[PDB]
Design an enzyme around this catalytic site. Structure first.
Site, PDB file in Angstrom:
ATOM      1  CG  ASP A 183     -15.455 -28.133  15.084  1.00  0.00           C
ATOM      2  OD1 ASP A 183     -15.365 -27.593  16.215  1.00  0.00           O
ATOM      3  OD2 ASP A 183     -14.624 -27.887  14.207  1.00  0.00           O
TER       4      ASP A 183
HETATM    5  O1  LIG Z   1     -19.083 -24.113  12.777  1.00  0.00           O
HETATM    6  P1  LIG Z   1     -19.173 -24.851  11.475  1.00  0.00           P
HETATM    7  O2  LIG Z   1     -18.148 -26.074  11.424  1.00  0.00           O
HETATM    8  O3  LIG Z   1     -20.470 -25.417  10.882  1.00  0.00           O
HETATM    9  O4  LIG Z   1     -18.610 -23.783  10.410  1.00  0.00           O
HETATM   10  C1  LIG Z   1     -17.239 -23.353  10.254  1.00  0.00           C
HETATM   11  C2  LIG Z   1     -17.074 -22.601   8.928  1.00  0.00           C
HETATM   12  C3  LIG Z   1     -15.682 -22.000   8.840  1.00  0.00           C
HETATM   13  C4  LIG Z   1     -17.265 -23.581   7.769  1.00  0.00           C
HETATM   14  C5  LIG Z   1     -18.156 -21.503   8.850  1.00  0.00           C
HETATM   15  O5  LIG Z   1     -18.356 -20.940  10.153  1.00  0.00           O
HETATM   16  C6  LIG Z   1     -17.930 -20.343   7.907  1.00  0.00           C
HETATM   17  O6  LIG Z   1     -17.117 -19.465   8.182  1.00  0.00           O
HETATM   18  N1  LIG Z   1     -18.694 -20.308   6.809  1.00  0.00           N
HETATM   19  C7  LIG Z   1     -18.630 -19.256   5.792  1.00  0.00           C
HETATM   20  C8  LIG Z   1     -18.443 -17.819   6.319  1.00  0.00           C
HETATM   21  C9  LIG Z   1     -19.740 -17.029   6.362  1.00  0.00           C
HETATM   22  O7  LIG Z   1     -19.711 -15.868   6.758  1.00  0.00           O
HETATM   23  N2  LIG Z   1     -20.856 -17.654   5.952  1.00  0.00           N
HETATM   24  C10 LIG Z   1     -22.186 -17.061   5.917  1.00  0.00           C
HETATM   25  C11 LIG Z   1     -23.082 -17.589   7.037  1.00  0.00           C
HETATM   26  S1  LIG Z   1     -23.537 -19.313   6.720  1.00  0.00           S
END
Ligand SMILES: *OP(=O)(O)OCC(C)(C)[C@@H](O)C(=O)NCCC(=O)NCCS
Length: 78
Positions: free
Chosen positions: A37
């Site tokens: 994921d």
């Molecule tokens: O659950 P998922 O694999 O789609 O996402 C995991 C990650 C670590 C890529 C994100 O949850 C993530 O932390 N994205 C950036 C952090 C934020 O606060 N982003 C803003 C909301 S999109």
């Protein structure tokens, strides 16, 4: 050795994704074959960076889709 970098990367993937090393092959796709994921993907790239002392840019990471992609990247970059 190819075998050496291969064996290191399989251990990293196995640990991150909870998949037996023997299931990990060159064309194994992280998301399509190994159940990764979005958090798995982030953890893997950071684990490659820590192990092989390379820096993988966001755009490079978006092109690392398979085991071979990751090995070829590391071999290119040491
Ligand atoms: O659950 P998922 O694999 O789609 O996402 C995991 C990650 C670590 C890529 C994100 O949850 C993530 O932390 N994205 C950036 C952090 C934020 O606060 N982003 C803003 C909301 S999109």
């Amino acid at each position: 050795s190819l075998k050496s970098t291969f064996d290191d990367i399989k251990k990293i993937i196995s640990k991150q994704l909870s998949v037996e090393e023997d299931k990990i092959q060159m064309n194994s796709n992280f998301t399509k074959d190994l159940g990764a994921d979005s958090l798995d993907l982030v953890e893997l790239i950071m684990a490659l960076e820590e192990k092989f002392n390379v820096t993988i840019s966001d755009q490079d990471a978006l092109k690392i889709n398979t085991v071979q992609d990751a090995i070829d990247y590391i071999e290119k970059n040491n």
